[PDB]
Structure formats: structure tokens, C-alpha cells
Amino acid sequence: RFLKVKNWETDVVLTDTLHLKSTLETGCTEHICMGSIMLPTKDQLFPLAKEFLDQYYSSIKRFGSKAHMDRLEEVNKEIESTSTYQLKDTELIYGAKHAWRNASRCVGRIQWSKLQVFDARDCTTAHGMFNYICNHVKYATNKGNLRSAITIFPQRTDGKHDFRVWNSQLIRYAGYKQPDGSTLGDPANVQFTEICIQQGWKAPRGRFDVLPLLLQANGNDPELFQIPPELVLEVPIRHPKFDWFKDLGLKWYGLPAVSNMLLEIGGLEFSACPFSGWYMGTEIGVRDYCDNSRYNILEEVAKKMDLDMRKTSSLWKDQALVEINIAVLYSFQSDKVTIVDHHSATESFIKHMENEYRCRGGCPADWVWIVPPMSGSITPVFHQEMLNYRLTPSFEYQPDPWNTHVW
Amino acid sequence: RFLKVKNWETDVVLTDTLHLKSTLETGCTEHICMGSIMLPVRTKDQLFPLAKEFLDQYYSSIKRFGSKAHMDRLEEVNKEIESTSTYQLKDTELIYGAKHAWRNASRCVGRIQWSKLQVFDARDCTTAHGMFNYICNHVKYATNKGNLRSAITIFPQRTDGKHDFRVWNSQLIRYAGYKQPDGSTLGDPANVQFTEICIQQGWKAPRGRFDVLPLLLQANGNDPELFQIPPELVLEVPIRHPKFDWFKDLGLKWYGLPAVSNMLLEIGGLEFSACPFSGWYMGTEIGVRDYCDNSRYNILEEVAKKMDLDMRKTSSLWKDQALVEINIAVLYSFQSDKVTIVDHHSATESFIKHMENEYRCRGGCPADWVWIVPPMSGSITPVFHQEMLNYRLTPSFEYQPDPWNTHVWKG
Ligand code: HEM
Ligand code: HEM
Ligand SMILES: Cc1cc(N)nc(CCc2cncc(CCc3cc(C)cc(N)n3)c2)c1
Ligand SMILES: Cc1cc(N)nc(CCc2cncc(CCc3cc(C)cc(N)n3)c2)c1
Ligand SMILES: Cc1cc(N)nc(CCc2cncc(CCc3cc(C)cc(N)n3)c2)c1
Ligand SMILES: Cc1cc(N)nc(CCc2cncc(CCc3cc(C)cc(N)n3)c2)c1
Ligand SMILES: [Cl-]
Ligand SMILES: [Cl-]
Ligand SMILES: [Zn+2]
Ligand SMILES: [Zn+2]
Ligand SMILES: [Zn+2]
């Protein structure tokens, strides 16, 4: 089963064979495409473990070897006895790197093999989780020279003793509903902020308040911890040409760190596995600042620019959007904090995709997420056909724990 | 059976039931999504079910389902197919069918307009000369001195597949492209292959940057024939910028009338291989796609040079800055010349209102996010955070391969 993908700018055609190794289901059918939908026992466990160990032993050119058979033997016995198994450190590192390699929504995967993996499987308490996370934040931040990292807490057992980070990202800003009816801070985080306050957090009640961590160890009720302020690197936003831009009082944090996803390796499930990289500029300047449901700053910026806001066809929104994104990139670069613009990032992804087709037989990719949220067609991913399918090991979305947890 | 779609900016949730009427396949499976793949004679047996499905839909839309007239029409079509292997649509059914192919076109952001379509019935056409006259009349009507009106012209349907009507042009109005011995291209690189065919057939090429191509028209399966659209029927707009006086000296212009001529219209199992249709432009089609695609006019560098932007590093966003100014110029120029055009903000806002109305009155609105989201400033338009469901309803417009690959040359 050879599927062709074409690039419409270059006419280059690539052949995908990797999709034949896909296992999980997409949500699409022959009758309906759901490509734009955001959320589309012992017996079960051994085939999953075997599938993974086969791929691992193949990667180190030891497939069918004594060491391969012996390990498969070992894992089988462990599952039959304990209803589960433990990954070797080599297997854990390989699995985490491949989960990133397989993440079809990630434009940054050229970097996949350079991931620092912190093994936190010996963690037993919420205070232990906090220490691990602080060390991750410090290592990853590296005074502005950011380094990709993942920290992996103990795997799910019976499902009643899950480790979870309640926060969606390790560093994010609070949001507060006002008597005015408006929102102060980040509207994305109003609900989580309320939970934090209810659990005892003393909120500063400002526009950019770094949220505390709510950490759940061993299925216990989550506990609150504040990340040491001096470990949270932030960048004030200014513009190279517009002196007034600084007076908007905008800032953002340097470290993008996802903490709400589930890492599946060899059928084992790691429900707390925070990971971090560095930002693409549009993530801050387009998504976080300009989404209507977020800080929604387009109107204020346009006003300061003296643009004709009376008609849409003046393209005042597009003009202000460009300037905000110029300011984001300028500010991070001036403060020596790693950032990538959308042109550079997409160029790198195409090179990565070409590498993956030649060395691996394909690269699953979700065009809806890969194409940047501004200036899509002038980047080299827009005219690139992509095939989206699910490979394991993988990162999977999991719902907010406050919808499931029983106190 | 219900599917839900969510808008991630507004939290508005809609419910689709219309997908139940979908027939044809998407290209996707349970194991693979092909959502970003651009390209993912019937027998008596298969035709009557297709005819019946269409006629049932038509008579339902006029509130005459199950009426004597409905039953009589089914009988009449049944007997026509069994006797002649095909059938003819009534004028009313043709109009309904063409409007619905547009309503159903999942890649079209302009569908709020679907019920306002002028249908020109050209099923009595027999020759390429006849096709040319119908096409000129379509261009003149649709252009309407700048007050653009949507229109479609429908030529005779397929019979045995050996007698097809085809417009060989991909669009009625488009510019020539010429590859030079040094490997550079003059004009529009999208049209080099078609231009060579025109020259080979006898066109005398001006060899400039914006030469309107001749029509190459195939009637009744015969070899195609060349015709020049009268220049006075081809409305064009020189591109200038409201603040930058040097913009005009880039020498840019574009034509006012976007008119697709290469698609197949399917109505009730019948196939109309020549059915040119036209509307009016969304600004980004010209300013982003036609001007800025690397494989097209590719003007970004030249514009950025004249703006004196910092072009040493991509992080200055020089390309983004130049792109906005080009698109401002396109909208300004069309508006100044009183030629209908819509900006991407207005167009997407109207589409979302159309979509919500369709969910309420029809139970759905199939839409292809990849094409619906504009090629610049996507996330600041209301379509970006809208979940969509893509599925195929008939009547429909389908892509067909370029006829120069398939045509049997008679001589
Ligand atoms: C090294 C720099 C990195 C860059 C520039 C980057 C870039 C991005 C971007 C731009 C997105 C989508 C955000 C949006 O569309 O608004 C994304 C998503 C994602 N990335 Fe990366 N990435 C990086 C590192 C990582 C790392 C280290 C991992 C895991 C080890 C990872 C895994 C993921 C996953 C799982 C998603 C989807 C997240 C979700 O579903 O919410 N990426 N990436
Ligand atoms: C009236 C104003 C109209 C506007 C503003 C408009 C807008 C557009 C746009 C922007 C595209 C996609 C182009 C791109 O992604 O670069 C498109 C595609 C399309 N539209 Fe419309 N449209 C209009 C009228 C029409 C009419 C009259 C019809 C047919 C009766 C039609 C049927 C289609 C079809 C079939 C496609 C897909 C074409 C393909 O696959 O090549 N549209 N429309
Ligand atoms: C409903 C829903 C589903 C889903 N799968 N993801 C989300 C969150 C999407 C999301 C929002 N902001 C931020 C991110 C993280 C993206 C990200 C992650 C990393 C590691 C690096 C980098 N530069 N960027 C992801 C929401
Ligand atoms: C839980 C939740 C609720 C809510 N109302 N919104 C969100 C954020 C939704 C969201 C908005 N913009 C951007 C993203 C990132 C993912 C993303 C999505 C799409 C469609 C394109 C693209 N390039 N990237 C996510 C999350
Ligand atoms: C390989 C391929 C497949 C496919 N389905 N379409 C194409 C052509 C895409 C395409 C390119 N330029 C222009 C259009 C026309 C879109 C269009 C059509 C109409 C009627 C009005 C309007 N404003 N815009 C379509 C190519
Ligand atoms: C026959 C043919 C060959 C070729 N190399 N390119 C083309 C045009 C491909 C093309 C390029 N940009 C734009 C389009 C329009 C359709 C389109 C495609 C996508 C991916 C997004 C979007 N918003 N709209 C089509 C056609
Ligand atoms: Cl966004
Ligand atoms: Cl484009
Ligand atoms: Zn799909
Ligand atoms: Zn967004
Ligand atoms: Zn393009």
C-alpha cells in the first residue's frame, strides 16, 4: 500500500509506506472527514508490549537476537504474574523520543532525537513531584538557551492511583471574572484559577499572575505548590520601531511546557509526563495575544497605530497582527531567549519530513495544526500534502482531572 | 445519528444530520485521514437510482413530494432511460441542480450567495463556434461593467464519453506563461503547458506579462478550436496602493472575472463536462495566491525591496509585511474602479452566518477547512476556530483531468 503525497509548489512526489504500521483510529470514515475536529487487562497488554519491543530491538539492529527473545520472554512472565511490567531505562528513553517523533500536530520534530529524558518513576509524593518539576523548569530554561526536556512520573496501575499534573501547562497565567463582566488576565484559565483559590491559593489578582501547580500523586487529592519566581523566565514585549508598544504592559513566559497529556509506551500509560521545548513566535503573538477568547489585543494595538478601523477592507487587523508578531520575536531575541519564527520552523519541518520519508517511509502530519495561524501560504508547509495517522508510542489528550476526580 | 461540531472561540455547538444523505467517498479511512490531499458512460442499472434520488430531492424542495406530477415525472424518466439509456432534465430541474452543486461545494467560502445564480442553458449548442458565442455572452452578463453577477453556462451532457463538450482552459480568463531558454518564465507560470498547446494550434502570442489566453473549445468530442475573447469584454484592474505611489510602477494588473471552466457538473446521474461558472474575487485569491505563490508571479521580494524592509533575516517578518501591503493594494484598486471584490474578513464572517443558517434549516453544511480558511491571517477570521465536517453531497462539481492528456486527436 503505497500512498503518494505531492508538493504543489515544487511538484516533488513522496511515497508513504509507514501508514501501514498505524494502529489507533482517526475518527474519519469513507463517508465523512473529521480532519478539522479537535477531539475526534493482561490479554490486551502483551500484544502492545510485543509490538513496542519488536520496534525497539529493530532500532538497535538486534531483531530476532537472543537478547530480543529473552526480553520478550521476561516481559511476558512479568505481565502474567503482576498484570503489568516495567520499562528498562533504554526503552523509556526510546519510547519518549518516539512519542515526540510520532506527534502529527508538532512542527518542531526536526529536534526529536535531542530530548533530555528525566526518569521520575521513583517519585511517591506530591512534594517529590514539585522538586522534579522545578529541576525540569531550571534545566529546560538554561538561562534562556532552552533545551527540550520531558519528566516522566510513575505509570498507571489500577487507574485509582494516577499521577496527574492538574495544570494544562507548567507555566501559565491566571484569569479572573470581574464585577464588570469582563475578564482580567488569561480567560483560558478562569476555571483552573477558581479551583486554585478554592484549594487555598492567595491570588495576586493581576493580568499576568503565574499559576501555582496542583499536583496529584498516587491518586491522592492534589496539593498546591508555587514555582520559585526566579525559575520562571519572562520577557517584556517591545517593538523595534514603535516606542509606544512597551506601554501596553505586555509580557510572556519563555518556557512552553505541556503538562496535561498522556504518554503511551508499549501499552503502559504515563498520565503525568510534562514536556517542554521553545516557542514559535506565532504561538504568542497570534494565538495567545490575538485569539478573541484570549488576551484579544488587536483593537488596542490598531488604535495606537492610527489605522482606519472603520472598514475591514483596510486590512487594519492584518497590519496590527504583523506588528505584534514582529514585537514578540524582537523581544525574545533581544533578551537572548530561544525562539523560532514561523518561516524558519516550517522550512525545518519540510527538511525533517523529507528525511523521514527517505529513512522511515513517512511522517504523519496534521495539516490543520502544522500550517501557522498567520501567513500560511507563504510558508513551505501550506502547499505540502500530508497524511495524518496515529503511531505508537504517542502523546494523547486527556480531559481536565477536575471533571473526574472525587475528593 | 448525530454529529456535533464546536466553535472554539464562541463555544457554540451545532449538530449535523445532513451527513446521513452523503453517498460518495472522501478518501479517508478509519486508519488514515486524507484531508490535505488535493485529489483524494454509466449503465442503465446505476442511473435510475441516481435519477430517482435527485427527483425526490427536487420535488421535496418544491413541496410536491408524492404528488401526481412527481410520480408522473419518475415514470417519464424511467421510460426514457430504459428506452434511450439516458434522460433530459427539465429547465426547472437544471436550475435547481446547478444551484445545489454550488450549495454543496465544500471548498467554497462564497456559498451564502448560492441561491443567486444565473443559469444559462446551452444544451442546444452543437459546435465550437456556438460554444464561443455562449461563452462571450456569459462573460458580458457576469461582468456587468464591474457590478459582477454570478453565472453558469451549461453545455450538452456526456453521452458515450466519445462526444464530450470541454473547455480546455482551466478558467475562461487567464494569462499566458512562456518558458524562456534561460529557464526563467514570462507571464503566469501556471499556464505554460496550456500556452504551448495554444501556440501549436496557431495562436500568435504577444509574449508579454499579462496576455489574455484564447479559448480552446471542444464540441461533441471533436478536436478543439481556438477563439479570442473580444478584448472589450475582458475587464481588468491596474493595481495601485493608497499610500505607496511606487506600487503602480510594478506594472501589475489583474482581470475582474474569476470563472472556472474545467470542472464536471453531476446532476441526477447526468454528467455535464463543460459548465463554466463565475462569481467575484476574494482579495487574497489575487494578492496571496496568484501574486505571491512561489510557482506563480512570485512578487514578494520585489515588493519588499521597494519597501526597504530588512530582508537579511526571516524574523523581521519582511514577507508578512509585504504580503499585507500587496493585499491592501488589490482591495483598494478593485474598490476604486468599482469592480466587485470581497475581503477575507467579510467573506469568512458571511460564510459562518451561512453555515449556522444551513445547520438550522438543512441539518448541515459540508465544508473543507483546508480550503475555507484564507491563505493569510487565518486565525483572526471566524472560520479558523470553527470545526467542520467534510462530506460529499450531490448535485456536485467534480475535478476532471486536463483534456490534453485524454483527448483522441482526430486530425
Ligand atoms: C523544540 C521546540 C518545539 C517547537 C518549536 C514545537 C512546536 C509546536 C507547535 C507550534 C505546536 C502547535 C501549537 C499551535 O498550533 O498553536 C506543537 C504541538 C505539539 N508538540 Fe511541539 N514543539 C517543540 C517541542 C516539542 C517537544 C519537546 C515535544 C514532546 C517531547 C512536543 C510535542 C508536541 C505535541 C504532543 C503537540 C500537540 C499538543 C496538543 O495536542 O495540545 N513538541 N508543537
Ligand atoms: C460569488 C462569489 C464567490 C466567491 C467569493 C467564491 C470564493 C471561492 C474561493 C476563495 C474558493 C477557493 C480558492 C482558493 O482556495 O484559492 C472557491 C472555490 C470554489 N467555488 Fe466559489 N466563490 C464564489 C462563487 C462561486 C460560484 C458561482 C460557484 C459555482 C456555481 C462556486 C463554486 C466553487 C467551487 C466548485 C470551488 C472549488 C474549485 C476547485 O476545486 O478548483 N463558487 N470559491
Ligand atoms: C481541546 C484541546 C485538545 C488538544 N489536543 N490540545 C489542546 C491545547 C492546544 C495547545 C494550546 N496552547 C499551547 C499548546 C502547546 C504547544 C507547544 C508545545 C511544545 C512542547 C512546544 C511548543 N512550542 N508549543 C497546545 C486543547
Ligand atoms: C480547553 C480549551 C477550550 C477552549 N475554548 N479553547 C481552547 C484553545 C483552542 C485553540 C485555539 N487556538 C489555537 C489552538 C492550537 C491548536 C491549533 C488548532 C488549529 C485549528 C490550528 C492550529 N494551527 N493550531 C487551540 C482550549
Ligand atoms: C489540482 C487542482 C484540483 C482542484 N480541485 N482545483 C484546482 C484549481 C484550484 C483553483 C485555482 N485557482 C482558482 C480557482 C477558482 C476559485 C474560485 C471560483 C469561483 C467561481 C469564484 C472565486 N472567487 N474563486 C481554483 C486544482
Ligand atoms: C494543476 C496544478 C498544478 C500545480 N503545480 N499547482 C496548481 C495550483 C495548486 C494551488 C496552489 N495554491 C492555491 C490553490 C487553491 C486551493 C487551496 C489549496 C489549499 C491547500 C488551501 C487553500 N486555502 N486553497 C491551489 C494546480
Ligand atoms: Cl490560533
Ligand atoms: Cl495559496
Ligand atoms: Zn479525514
Ligand atoms: Zn487560536
Ligand atoms: Zn497557493
From Swiss-Prot, chain A:
Please identify the protein, giving its name as recorded: Nitric oxide synthase 1
Query: Where heme b is bound, by residue?
Result: 106, 397
Q: What is known of its domains?
A: The PDZ domain participates in protein-protein interaction, and is responsible for targeting nNos to synaptic membranes. Mediates interaction with VAC14.
User: What does the UniProt entry list as the effect of changing residue 279 to F?
Assistant: No decrease in nitric-oxide synthase activity
The residues that the entry says bind (6R)-L-erythro-5,6,7,8-tetrahydrobiopterin are 36, 368-369, 382
How does this chain assemble? Homodimer. Interacts with DLG4 (via N-terminal tandem pair of PDZ domains); the interaction possibly being prevented by the association between NOS1 and CAPON. Forms a ternary complex with CAPON and RASD1. Forms a ternary complex with CAPON and SYN1. Interacts with ZDHHC23. Interacts with NOSIP; which may impair its synaptic location. Interacts with HTR4. Interacts with SLC6A4. Interacts with VAC14.
Q: What does this protein do?
A: Produces nitric oxide (NO) which is a messenger molecule with diverse functions throughout the body. In the brain and peripheral nervous system, NO displays many properties of a neurotransmitter. Inhibitory transmitter for non-adrenergic and non-cholinergic nerves in the colorectum. Probably has nitrosylase activity and mediates cysteine S-nitrosylation of cytoplasmic target proteins such SRR. Inhibitory transmitter for non-adrenergic and non-cholinergic nerves in the colorectum.
Q: Which residues bind L-arginine?
A: 169, 278-279, 283
Q: Which organism is it from?
A: Rattus norvegicus (Rat)
Q: What is the annotated tissue distribution of the protein whose record heads this document? A: Isoform N-NOS-1 is expressed in brain and colorectum. Found in the Auerbach's plexus of the enteric nervous system. Isoform PNNOS is expressed in the penis, urethra, prostate, and skeletal muscle, and coexists with the cerebellar nnos in the pelvic plexus, bladder and liver, and is detectable in the cerebellum.
Question: What's this protein's family per the entry?
Answer: Belongs to the NOS family.
Q: How is it modified after translation?
A: Ubiquitinated; mediated by STUB1/CHIP in the presence of Hsp70 and Hsp40 (in vitro).
Q: Where in the cell is it found?
A: Cell membrane, Sarcolemma; Cell projection, Dendritic spine
